Amino acid sequence: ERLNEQNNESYRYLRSVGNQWQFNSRLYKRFDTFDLDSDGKMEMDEVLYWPDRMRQLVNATDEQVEKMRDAVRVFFLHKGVEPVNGLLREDWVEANRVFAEAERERERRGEPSLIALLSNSYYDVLDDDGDGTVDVDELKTMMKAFDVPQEAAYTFFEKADTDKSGKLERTELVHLFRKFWM
Numbered sequence: 001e002r003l004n005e006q007n008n009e010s011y012r013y014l015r016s017v018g019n020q021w022q023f024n025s026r027l028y029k030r031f032d033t034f035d036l037d038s039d040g041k042m043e044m045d046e047v048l049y050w051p052d053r054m055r056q057l058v059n060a061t062d063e064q065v066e067k068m069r070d071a072v073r074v075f076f077l078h079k080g081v082e083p084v085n086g087l088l089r090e091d092w093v094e095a096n097r098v099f100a101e102a103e104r105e106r107e108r109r110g111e112p113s114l115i116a117l118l119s120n121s122y123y124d125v126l127d128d129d130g131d132g133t134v135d136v137d138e139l140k141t142m143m144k145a146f147d148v149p150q151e152a153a154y155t156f157f158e159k160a161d162t163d164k165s166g167k168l169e170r171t172e173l174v175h176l177f178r179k180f181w182m
């Protein structure tokens with residue numbers, strides 16, 4: 001009905017590979033957090049707010065910052081944020097479901113996961129001392145960029161630091177992103 005190939009990049013993707021999948025309050029809290037002016041629509045300039053704040057907190061290379069901005073753009077375009085029309089609240093749930101199928105389809109096809117590309121682009125920006133890994137204080141900066149209490153990094157670092165090494169490796173940050181989105 002509402003979202004389709006002409007409307008939504010995850011539908012465009014599914015149909016380009018022949019996958020016929022059709023869509024039949026914690027989730028809505030998420031939309032309403034992204035909808036910065038509370039008008040009932042998510043637009044791309046609103047989603048680019050988050051990497052723009054992250055970039056102020058650290059001193060990543062222009063290349064890293066652009067890899068992050070572009071990965072956030074791609075991610076949210078596939079999450080249903082269209083360049084002109086953006087994404088309506090009425091469409092949020094179905095945009096999330098079709099996106100989850102598109103991520104499954106990518107993985108079957110051996111194609112890169114968009115959540116993984118997002119997470120890796122943050123990882124390079126978060127590792128602000130260049131030692132190779134993200135520590136808990138670097139994770140706080142992430143919480144600060146996302147407007148979440150910095151102390152919540154203790155909780156998240158713990159859940160994510162699955163090899164108990166005291167540092168997040170790339171795959172662990174991917175795990176934390178993924179648990180978060182789907």
Ligand SMILES: [Ca+2]
Nearest residue numbers: 035037039041
């Ligand atoms: Ca809005």
Ligand SMILES: [Ca+2]
Nearest residue numbers: 127131133134
């Ligand atoms: Ca580091």
Ligand SMILES: [Ca+2]
Nearest residue numbers: 161165167169
């Ligand atoms: Ca670890």
Ligand SMILES: [Mg+2]
Nearest residue numbers: 037043045046
């Ligand atoms: Mg606006």
